[PDB]
């Protein structure tokens, strides 16, 4: 049972200062120690509890391993080969004129993201619009950029790592007191880059949805959390960012930043349902990272 409160502010609650009982190393006396969980980590019961306890038994990510996408080259054994299409305009389906053969693919960093494709291969010449069925509004529309879009993301909270030992051996990593100002995580997109790249895609959308058609964009229809937000990892933490400001446009037939609100969560159930939970350990200091927007994942609704 978590007895929790707000965070020292002076407003909108976002975080929780939680206290609980805890098994020490010995199977005898308990421990009165405190953590500090985001609102998405916990849930009340009519006093709180962790948001996973009523679903999946949980496991804590080891603090030595890094979730940093490294290049991965896939290969095939003997008696097999892999073909690489090498033309500049290919919607991934149909015959390829300039086919070349390779043994192992190019470095493919497994970037687990949603909505915004990150650190991917850049397209060639015109931006690419790839779909399984353009007439069906039930298949996602993969997009690949030619010019990358610059995105910055800070976690400007100088947080603390408390190590409460639930021994013998094992030890949980919590969040101590916060050193500095109460801010939240934000991703920046330059206003000048996102306007030219948005119009570059819609001239490609006119090639498929009528010449003099009107193309509009809105945020997520709703449903689950992962679908609506820009889920991604960087520095270990898991961000969940609001893209109502990147998809609020209406195009007809013919200097600052765009900051995006980002939440945060420690306990996660990745790839829909696999791997149980995972409480990624907290991260000290101000986390900052730059990523490349090299594509988008769009859906269509069921004139314009």
């Amino acid at each position, epitope marked *: 049972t978590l007895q929790c409160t707000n965070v020292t502010n*002076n407003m909108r609650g976002e975080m929780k200062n939680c206290s609980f009982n805890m098994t020490t190393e010995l199977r005898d006396k308990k421990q009165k120690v405190y953590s500090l969980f985001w609102r998405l980590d916990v849930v009340q019961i009519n006093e709180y509890r962790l948001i996973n306890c009523n679903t999946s038994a949980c496991t804590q990510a080891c603090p030595k391993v890094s979730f940093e996408p490294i290049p991965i080259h896939y290969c095939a054994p003997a008696g097999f080969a892999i073909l690489k299409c090498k033309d500049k305009k290919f919607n991934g389906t149909g015959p390829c004129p300039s086919v070349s053969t390779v043994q192992c693919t190019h470095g493919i960093k497994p970037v687990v993201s949603t909505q915004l494709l990150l650190n991917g291969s850049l397209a060639e010449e015109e931006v690419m619009i790839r779909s399984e069925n353009i007439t069906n509004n039930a298949k996602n529309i993969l997009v690949q950029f030619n010019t990358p879009v610059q995105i910055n993301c800070t976690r400007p909270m100088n947080m603390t790592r408390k190590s409460i030992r639930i021994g013998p051996g094992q030890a949980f990593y919590a969040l101590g007191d916060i050193i500095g100002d109460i801010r939240q995580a934000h991703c920046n997109v330059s206003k000048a880059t996102w306007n030219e790249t948005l119009g570059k895609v819609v001239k490609q959308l006119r090639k498929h949805f009528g010449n003099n058609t009107i193309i509009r964009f809105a945020n997520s229809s709703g449903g689950d959390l992962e679908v609506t937000t820009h889920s991604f990892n960087c520095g270990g933490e898991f961000f969940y960012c609001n893209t109502s400001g990147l998809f609020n446009s209406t195009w007809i037939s013919n200097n600052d930043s765009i900051t995006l609100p980002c939440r945060m969560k420690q306990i996660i159930n990745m790839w829909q349902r696999i791997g149980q939970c995972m409480y990624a350990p907290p991260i000290q200091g101000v986390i900052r990272c730059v990523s490349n927007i090299t594509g988008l994942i769009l859906t269509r609704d069921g004139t314009t």
Partner: antibody
Amino acid sequence: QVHLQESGPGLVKPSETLSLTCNVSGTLVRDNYWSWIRQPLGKQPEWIGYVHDSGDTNYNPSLKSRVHLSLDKSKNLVSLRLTGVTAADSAIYYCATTKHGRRIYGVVAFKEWFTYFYMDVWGKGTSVTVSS
Amino acid sequence: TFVSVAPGQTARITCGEESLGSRSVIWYQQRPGQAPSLIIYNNNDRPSGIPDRFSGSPGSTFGTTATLTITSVEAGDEADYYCHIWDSRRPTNWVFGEGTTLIVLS
């Protein structure tokens, strides 16, 4: 030049209405903020509350249900009203101009800022003793 | 509290709790028998009429109090000093932090 002057009864019986007047000479009471501060003998200056035109006025959380300020735009003087006084409210009531500032520590757009006030031009002060 | 510094040296003045967020400390000078006057607002911004001998600790250090450094001490700066801790994690402070008194030796 800016000259401030507090005039008051000097003596008010317990559980009575203190009525203070701060005559202002050198500027108007509409373009500036205004603030009273009281200082017991030997204690630190305790803030009371700031007042300005356009309904922008706030009081100390400790003396809330008892104090009422006002700006006389026609007579160009600041008034104070402290209701239900005790021996605690005996102090020295100053009256000063107030300028404001905006401390920006975050990203501005996220309301990550707070307004701070500071008094620059004081008055001489009135002595208010409470005794029956 | 009190602070003693010889004529011509440097005085430093402690006031208020420790800093938990970014602050805007406001220092004041109360001469004996007079009204208090403004010395340093916005952590180290001096208004007109105050010399550059007075400097306050920057309101950007998390975990240090509000310090009022006073260089070239003179027999005139023998007066009281309060401050006004404006903190982002503290609600509005309406009582000034307890004062500090400067005493000029010799």
